Every structure is written in C-alpha cells, then in structure tokens.
PDB file of all heavy atoms in Angstrom:
ATOM      1  N   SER O 208     -18.998 -35.111  68.840  1.00 27.19           N
ATOM      2  CA  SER O 208     -20.360 -35.612  68.917  1.00 27.19           C
ATOM      3  C   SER O 208     -20.610 -36.843  68.055  1.00 27.19           C
ATOM      4  O   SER O 208     -21.198 -37.824  68.514  1.00 27.19           O
ATOM      5  CB  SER O 208     -21.346 -34.519  68.508  1.00 27.19           C
ATOM      6  OG  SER O 208     -22.623 -35.079  68.263  1.00 27.19           O
ATOM      7  N   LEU O 209     -20.163 -36.795  66.806  1.00 28.01           N
ATOM      8  CA  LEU O 209     -20.389 -37.910  65.896  1.00 28.01           C
ATOM      9  C   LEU O 209     -19.724 -39.201  66.347  1.00 28.01           C
ATOM     10  O   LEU O 209     -20.296 -40.279  66.197  1.00 28.01           O
ATOM     11  CB  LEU O 209     -19.961 -37.512  64.480  1.00 28.01           C
ATOM     12  CG  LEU O 209     -20.871 -36.344  64.064  1.00 28.01           C
ATOM     13  CD1 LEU O 209     -20.437 -35.718  62.739  1.00 28.01           C
ATOM     14  CD2 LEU O 209     -22.302 -36.864  63.989  1.00 28.01           C
ATOM     15  N   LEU O 210     -18.528 -39.088  66.918  1.00 28.93           N
ATOM     16  CA  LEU O 210     -17.810 -40.250  67.415  1.00 28.93           C
ATOM     17  C   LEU O 210     -18.539 -40.810  68.629  1.00 28.93           C
ATOM     18  O   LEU O 210     -18.630 -42.019  68.814  1.00 28.93           O
ATOM     19  CB  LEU O 210     -16.389 -39.864  67.818  1.00 28.93           C
ATOM     20  CG  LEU O 210     -15.461 -39.523  66.660  1.00 28.93           C
ATOM     21  CD1 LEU O 210     -14.167 -38.910  67.200  1.00 28.93           C
ATOM     22  CD2 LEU O 210     -15.196 -40.789  65.855  1.00 28.93           C
ATOM     23  N   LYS O 211     -19.056 -39.920  69.465  1.00 30.75           N
ATOM     24  CA  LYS O 211     -19.774 -40.341  70.654  1.00 30.75           C
ATOM     25  C   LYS O 211     -21.071 -41.045  70.274  1.00 30.75           C
ATOM     26  O   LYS O 211     -21.550 -41.900  71.020  1.00 30.75           O
ATOM     27  CB  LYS O 211     -20.079 -39.130  71.535  1.00 30.75           C
ATOM     28  CG  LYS O 211     -20.974 -39.426  72.717  1.00 30.75           C
ATOM     29  CD  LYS O 211     -21.352 -38.143  73.417  1.00 30.75           C
ATOM     30  CE  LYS O 211     -22.449 -38.366  74.434  1.00 30.75           C
ATOM     31  NZ  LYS O 211     -22.879 -37.077  75.035  1.00 30.75           N
ATOM     32  N   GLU O 212     -21.643 -40.687  69.124  1.00 31.22           N
ATOM     33  CA  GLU O 212     -22.890 -41.308  68.681  1.00 31.22           C
ATOM     34  C   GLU O 212     -22.700 -42.563  67.832  1.00 31.22           C
ATOM     35  O   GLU O 212     -23.641 -43.022  67.191  1.00 31.22           O
ATOM     36  CB  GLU O 212     -23.772 -40.309  67.909  1.00 31.22           C
ATOM     37  CG  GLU O 212     -24.209 -39.108  68.712  1.00 31.22           C
ATOM     38  CD  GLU O 212     -24.881 -39.485  70.023  1.00 31.22           C
ATOM     39  OE1 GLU O 212     -25.324 -40.647  70.173  1.00 31.22           O
ATOM     40  OE2 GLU O 212     -24.970 -38.609  70.907  1.00 31.22           O
ATOM     41  N   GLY O 213     -21.490 -43.114  67.811  1.00 32.89           N
ATOM     42  CA  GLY O 213     -21.275 -44.338  67.050  1.00 32.89           C
ATOM     43  C   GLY O 213     -20.581 -44.291  65.700  1.00 32.89           C
ATOM     44  O   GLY O 213     -20.373 -45.335  65.086  1.00 32.89           O
ATOM     45  N   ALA O 214     -20.225 -43.109  65.217  1.00 32.92           N
ATOM     46  CA  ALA O 214     -19.545 -43.032  63.930  1.00 32.92           C
ATOM     47  C   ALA O 214     -18.140 -43.617  64.113  1.00 32.92           C
ATOM     48  O   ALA O 214     -17.385 -43.150  64.953  1.00 32.92           O
ATOM     49  CB  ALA O 214     -19.465 -41.577  63.455  1.00 32.92           C
ATOM     50  N   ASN O 215     -17.801 -44.644  63.336  1.00 36.86           N
ATOM     51  CA  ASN O 215     -16.490 -45.274  63.448  1.00 36.86           C
ATOM     52  C   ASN O 215     -15.430 -44.313  62.947  1.00 36.86           C
ATOM     53  O   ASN O 215     -14.282 -44.331  63.398  1.00 36.86           O
ATOM     54  CB  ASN O 215     -16.434 -46.567  62.632  1.00 36.86           C
ATOM     55  CG  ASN O 215     -17.475 -47.585  63.070  1.00 36.86           C
ATOM     56  OD1 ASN O 215     -18.598 -47.618  62.552  1.00 36.86           O
ATOM     57  ND2 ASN O 215     -17.111 -48.416  64.040  1.00 36.86           N
ATOM     58  N   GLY O 216     -15.823 -43.472  62.000  1.00 39.05           N
ATOM     59  CA  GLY O 216     -14.898 -42.502  61.464  1.00 39.05           C
ATOM     60  C   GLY O 216     -15.638 -41.264  61.008  1.00 39.05           C
ATOM     61  O   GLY O 216     -16.824 -41.314  60.672  1.00 39.05           O
ATOM     62  N   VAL O 217     -14.945 -40.140  60.994  1.00 38.76           N
ATOM     63  CA  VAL O 217     -15.562 -38.903  60.562  1.00 38.76           C
ATOM     64  C   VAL O 217     -14.789 -38.359  59.376  1.00 38.76           C
ATOM     65  O   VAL O 217     -13.578 -38.175  59.451  1.00 38.76           O
ATOM     66  CB  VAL O 217     -15.566 -37.864  61.699  1.00 38.76           C
ATOM     67  CG1 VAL O 217     -16.122 -36.515  61.184  1.00 38.76           C
ATOM     68  CG2 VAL O 217     -16.380 -38.402  62.870  1.00 38.76           C
ATOM     69  N   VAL O 218     -15.493 -38.129  58.274  1.00 37.07           N
ATOM     70  CA  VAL O 218     -14.871 -37.590  57.082  1.00 37.07           C
ATOM     71  C   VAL O 218     -14.798 -36.081  57.231  1.00 37.07           C
ATOM     72  O   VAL O 218     -15.613 -35.473  57.916  1.00 37.07           O
ATOM     73  CB  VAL O 218     -15.694 -37.938  55.815  1.00 37.07           C
ATOM     74  CG1 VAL O 218     -15.183 -37.146  54.597  1.00 37.07           C
ATOM     75  CG2 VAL O 218     -15.593 -39.423  55.534  1.00 37.07           C
ATOM     76  N   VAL O 219     -13.790 -35.478  56.626  1.00 37.39           N
ATOM     77  CA  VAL O 219     -13.654 -34.035  56.665  1.00 37.39           C
ATOM     78  C   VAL O 219     -13.316 -33.638  55.245  1.00 37.39           C
ATOM     79  O   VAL O 219     -12.159 -33.729  54.827  1.00 37.39           O
ATOM     80  CB  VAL O 219     -12.530 -33.572  57.601  1.00 37.39           C
ATOM     81  CG1 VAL O 219     -12.472 -32.046  57.617  1.00 37.39           C
ATOM     82  CG2 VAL O 219     -12.777 -34.101  59.006  1.00 37.39           C
ATOM     83  N   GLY O 220     -14.340 -33.219  54.505  1.00 38.68           N
ATOM     84  CA  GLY O 220     -14.150 -32.824  53.123  1.00 38.68           C
ATOM     85  C   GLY O 220     -14.346 -31.344  52.859  1.00 38.68           C
ATOM     86  O   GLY O 220     -13.383 -30.614  52.614  1.00 38.68           O
ATOM     87  N   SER O 221     -15.595 -30.897  52.904  1.00 36.48           N
ATOM     88  CA  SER O 221     -15.895 -29.495  52.654  1.00 36.48           C
ATOM     89  C   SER O 221     -14.982 -28.539  53.415  1.00 36.48           C
ATOM     90  O   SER O 221     -14.398 -27.634  52.830  1.00 36.48           O
ATOM     91  CB  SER O 221     -17.354 -29.203  53.000  1.00 36.48           C
ATOM     92  OG  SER O 221     -18.212 -29.969  52.173  1.00 36.48           O
ATOM     93  N   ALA O 222     -14.847 -28.748  54.717  1.00 36.22           N
ATOM     94  CA  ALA O 222     -14.021 -27.864  55.519  1.00 36.22           C
ATOM     95  C   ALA O 222     -12.617 -27.679  54.944  1.00 36.22           C
ATOM     96  O   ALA O 222     -12.041 -26.596  55.052  1.00 36.22           O
ATOM     97  CB  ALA O 222     -13.941 -28.380  56.936  1.00 36.22           C
ATOM     98  N   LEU O 223     -12.078 -28.731  54.331  1.00 36.87           N
ATOM     99  CA  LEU O 223     -10.740 -28.687  53.753  1.00 36.87           C
ATOM    100  C   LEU O 223     -10.750 -28.112  52.339  1.00 36.87           C
ATOM    101  O   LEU O 223      -9.853 -27.353  51.957  1.00 36.87           O
ATOM    102  CB  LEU O 223     -10.134 -30.090  53.721  1.00 36.87           C
ATOM    103  CG  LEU O 223     -10.048 -30.825  55.057  1.00 36.87           C
ATOM    104  CD1 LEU O 223      -9.296 -32.135  54.870  1.00 36.87           C
ATOM    105  CD2 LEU O 223      -9.353 -29.944  56.080  1.00 36.87           C
ATOM    106  N   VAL O 224     -11.773 -28.482  51.575  1.00 34.03           N
ATOM    107  CA  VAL O 224     -11.939 -28.027  50.202  1.00 34.03           C
ATOM    108  C   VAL O 224     -12.144 -26.513  50.162  1.00 34.03           C
ATOM    109  O   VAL O 224     -11.626 -25.824  49.281  1.00 34.03           O
ATOM    110  CB  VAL O 224     -13.140 -28.739  49.544  1.00 34.03           C
ATOM    111  CG1 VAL O 224     -13.272 -28.328  48.089  1.00 34.03           C
ATOM    112  CG2 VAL O 224     -12.958 -30.241  49.654  1.00 34.03           C
ATOM    113  N   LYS O 225     -12.900 -25.996  51.122  1.00 33.64           N
ATOM    114  CA  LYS O 225     -13.147 -24.562  51.180  1.00 33.64           C
ATOM    115  C   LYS O 225     -11.822 -23.806  51.305  1.00 33.64           C
ATOM    116  O   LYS O 225     -11.652 -22.726  50.734  1.00 33.64           O
ATOM    117  CB  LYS O 225     -14.072 -24.244  52.364  1.00 33.64           C
ATOM    118  CG  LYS O 225     -14.021 -22.808  52.865  1.00 33.64           C
ATOM    119  CD  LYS O 225     -15.120 -22.550  53.891  1.00 33.64           C
ATOM    120  CE  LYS O 225     -14.940 -21.202  54.594  1.00 33.64           C
ATOM    121  NZ  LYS O 225     -13.719 -21.186  55.462  1.00 33.64           N
ATOM    122  N   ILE O 226     -10.883 -24.379  52.048  1.00 33.64           N
ATOM    123  CA  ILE O 226      -9.587 -23.745  52.231  1.00 33.64           C
ATOM    124  C   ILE O 226      -8.742 -23.855  50.963  1.00 33.64           C
ATOM    125  O   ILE O 226      -7.974 -22.943  50.645  1.00 33.64           O
ATOM    126  CB  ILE O 226      -8.845 -24.353  53.451  1.00 33.64           C
ATOM    127  CG1 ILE O 226      -9.512 -23.850  54.743  1.00 33.64           C
ATOM    128  CG2 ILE O 226      -7.358 -23.996  53.417  1.00 33.64           C
ATOM    129  CD1 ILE O 226      -8.932 -24.428  56.008  1.00 33.64           C
ATOM    130  N   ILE O 227      -8.899 -24.953  50.229  1.00 31.88           N
ATOM    131  CA  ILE O 227      -8.153 -25.152  48.988  1.00 31.88           C
ATOM    132  C   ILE O 227      -8.700 -24.268  47.865  1.00 31.88           C
ATOM    133  O   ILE O 227      -7.948 -23.818  46.996  1.00 31.88           O
ATOM    134  CB  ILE O 227      -8.194 -26.639  48.544  1.00 31.88           C
ATOM    135  CG1 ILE O 227      -7.341 -27.481  49.502  1.00 31.88           C
ATOM    136  CG2 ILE O 227      -7.714 -26.787  47.101  1.00 31.88           C
ATOM    137  CD1 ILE O 227      -7.440 -28.976  49.250  1.00 31.88           C
ATOM    138  N   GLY O 228     -10.009 -24.027  47.877  1.00 33.83           N
ATOM    139  CA  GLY O 228     -10.608 -23.183  46.858  1.00 33.83           C
ATOM    140  C   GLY O 228     -10.100 -21.765  47.035  1.00 33.83           C
ATOM    141  O   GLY O 228      -9.955 -21.006  46.071  1.00 33.83           O
ATOM    142  N   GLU O 229      -9.806 -21.412  48.280  1.00 35.13           N
ATOM    143  CA  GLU O 229      -9.312 -20.081  48.583  1.00 35.13           C
ATOM    144  C   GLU O 229      -7.786 -19.966  48.495  1.00 35.13           C
ATOM    145  O   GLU O 229      -7.266 -19.189  47.690  1.00 35.13           O
ATOM    146  CB  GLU O 229      -9.773 -19.655  49.976  1.00 35.13           C
ATOM    147  CG  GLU O 229      -9.589 -18.171  50.233  1.00 35.13           C
ATOM    148  CD  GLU O 229     -10.151 -17.729  51.569  1.00 35.13           C
ATOM    149  OE1 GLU O 229     -10.554 -18.607  52.372  1.00 35.13           O
ATOM    150  OE2 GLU O 229     -10.184 -16.502  51.817  1.00 35.13           O
ATOM    151  N   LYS O 230      -7.082 -20.745  49.315  1.00 34.63           N
ATOM    152  CA  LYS O 230      -5.619 -20.715  49.365  1.00 34.63           C
ATOM    153  C   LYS O 230      -4.853 -21.322  48.189  1.00 34.63           C
ATOM    154  O   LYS O 230      -3.674 -21.034  48.021  1.00 34.63           O
ATOM    155  CB  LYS O 230      -5.126 -21.390  50.649  1.00 34.63           C
ATOM    156  CG  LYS O 230      -5.611 -20.745  51.934  1.00 34.63           C
ATOM    157  CD  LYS O 230      -5.207 -19.281  52.010  1.00 34.63           C
ATOM    158  CE  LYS O 230      -5.588 -18.689  53.348  1.00 34.63           C
ATOM    159  NZ  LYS O 230      -5.430 -17.221  53.335  1.00 34.63           N
ATOM    160  N   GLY O 231      -5.499 -22.160  47.386  1.00 35.38           N
ATOM    161  CA  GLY O 231      -4.805 -22.778  46.263  1.00 35.38           C
ATOM    162  C   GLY O 231      -3.665 -23.687  46.709  1.00 35.38           C
ATOM    163  O   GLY O 231      -3.823 -24.465  47.646  1.00 35.38           O
ATOM    164  N   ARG O 232      -2.515 -23.588  46.045  1.00 32.89           N
ATOM    165  CA  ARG O 232      -1.353 -24.403  46.387  1.00 32.89           C
ATOM    166  C   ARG O 232      -0.853 -24.144  47.795  1.00 32.89           C
ATOM    167  O   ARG O 232      -0.227 -25.013  48.405  1.00 32.89           O
ATOM    168  CB  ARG O 232      -0.205 -24.141  45.411  1.00 32.89           C
ATOM    169  CG  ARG O 232      -0.425 -24.714  44.034  1.00 32.89           C
ATOM    170  CD  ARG O 232       0.525 -24.090  43.022  1.00 32.89           C
ATOM    171  NE  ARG O 232       1.905 -24.574  43.100  1.00 32.89           N
ATOM    172  CZ  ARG O 232       2.339 -25.715  42.565  1.00 32.89           C
ATOM    173  NH1 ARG O 232       1.502 -26.512  41.911  1.00 32.89           N
ATOM    174  NH2 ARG O 232       3.622 -26.042  42.656  1.00 32.89           N
ATOM    175  N   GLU O 233      -1.119 -22.948  48.309  1.00 34.00           N
ATOM    176  CA  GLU O 233      -0.679 -22.585  49.652  1.00 34.00           C
ATOM    177  C   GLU O 233      -1.692 -22.997  50.717  1.00 34.00           C
ATOM    178  O   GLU O 233      -1.701 -22.447  51.817  1.00 34.00           O
ATOM    179  CB  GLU O 233      -0.427 -21.077  49.735  1.00 34.00           C
ATOM    180  CG  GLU O 233       0.432 -20.539  48.606  1.00 34.00           C
ATOM    181  CD  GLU O 233       1.744 -21.280  48.477  1.00 34.00           C
ATOM    182  OE1 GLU O 233       2.390 -21.526  49.522  1.00 34.00           O
ATOM    183  OE2 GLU O 233       2.128 -21.613  47.332  1.00 34.00           O
ATOM    184  N   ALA O 234      -2.537 -23.970  50.396  1.00 30.00           N
ATOM    185  CA  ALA O 234      -3.545 -24.434  51.343  1.00 30.00           C
ATOM    186  C   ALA O 234      -2.972 -25.291  52.469  1.00 30.00           C
ATOM    187  O   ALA O 234      -3.496 -25.274  53.585  1.00 30.00           O
ATOM    188  CB  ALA O 234      -4.626 -25.213  50.608  1.00 30.00           C
ATOM    189  N   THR O 235      -1.899 -26.024  52.165  1.00 33.92           N
ATOM    190  CA  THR O 235      -1.233 -26.933  53.105  1.00 33.92           C
ATOM    191  C   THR O 235      -1.247 -26.546  54.585  1.00 33.92           C
ATOM    192  O   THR O 235      -1.923 -27.180  55.396  1.00 33.92           O
ATOM    193  CB  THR O 235       0.240 -27.168  52.702  1.00 33.92           C
ATOM    194  OG1 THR O 235       0.299 -27.653  51.356  1.00 33.92           O
ATOM    195  CG2 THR O 235       0.887 -28.200  53.624  1.00 33.92           C
ATOM    196  N   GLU O 236      -0.489 -25.517  54.935  1.00 35.67           N
ATOM    197  CA  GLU O 236      -0.389 -25.060  56.315  1.00 35.67           C
ATOM    198  C   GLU O 236      -1.740 -24.793  56.977  1.00 35.67           C
ATOM    199  O   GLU O 236      -1.941 -25.130  58.150  1.00 35.67           O
ATOM    200  CB  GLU O 236       0.470 -23.795  56.384  1.00 35.67           C
ATOM    201  CG  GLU O 236       1.680 -23.801  55.454  1.00 35.67           C
ATOM    202  CD  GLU O 236       1.295 -23.641  53.983  1.00 35.67           C
ATOM    203  OE1 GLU O 236       0.097 -23.407  53.699  1.00 35.67           O
ATOM    204  OE2 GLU O 236       2.191 -23.743  53.112  1.00 35.67           O
ATOM    205  N   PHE O 237      -2.661 -24.178  56.239  1.00 32.82           N
ATOM    206  CA  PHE O 237      -3.987 -23.885  56.781  1.00 32.82           C
ATOM    207  C   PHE O 237      -4.791 -25.177  56.998  1.00 32.82           C
ATOM    208  O   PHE O 237      -5.614 -25.264  57.912  1.00 32.82           O
ATOM    209  CB  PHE O 237      -4.751 -22.940  55.844  1.00 32.82           C
ATOM    210  CG  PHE O 237      -4.056 -21.626  55.601  1.00 32.82           C
ATOM    211  CD1 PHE O 237      -3.298 -21.424  54.449  1.00 32.82           C
ATOM    212  CD2 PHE O 237      -4.151 -20.591  56.531  1.00 32.82           C
ATOM    213  CE1 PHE O 237      -2.648 -20.206  54.226  1.00 32.82           C
ATOM    214  CE2 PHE O 237      -3.504 -19.375  56.319  1.00 32.82           C
ATOM    215  CZ  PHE O 237      -2.753 -19.178  55.167  1.00 32.82           C
TER     216      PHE O 237
END
C-alpha cells in the first residue's frame, strides 16, 4: 500500500526489533 501511494522506500524497524528483543542473537533466521 505505501509503495502504491508514493513512498519511495519503506522502512522496517519495529517489526524487526520486536524479533530481536525476543530472539536475541538467534534473531537472524526469523
């Protein structure tokens, strides 16, 4: 949706950080 509405790029932070807060060093694969 965001790309279709003109966003040149989409950042993905929280979604990844949430996995790192949980998985720790083993976050990679997830």
Side-chain angles (χ1 to χ4, degrees):
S208 166
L209 297 172
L210 290 170
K211 173 187 169 184
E212 298 307 342
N215 301 91
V217 175
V218 169
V219 182
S221 298
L223 303 186
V224 183
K225 159 171 170 293
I226 287 177
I227 289 173
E229 194 175 8
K230 300 302 185 191
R232 288 163 76 81
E233 311 306 315
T235 304
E236 321 72 6
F237 301 99

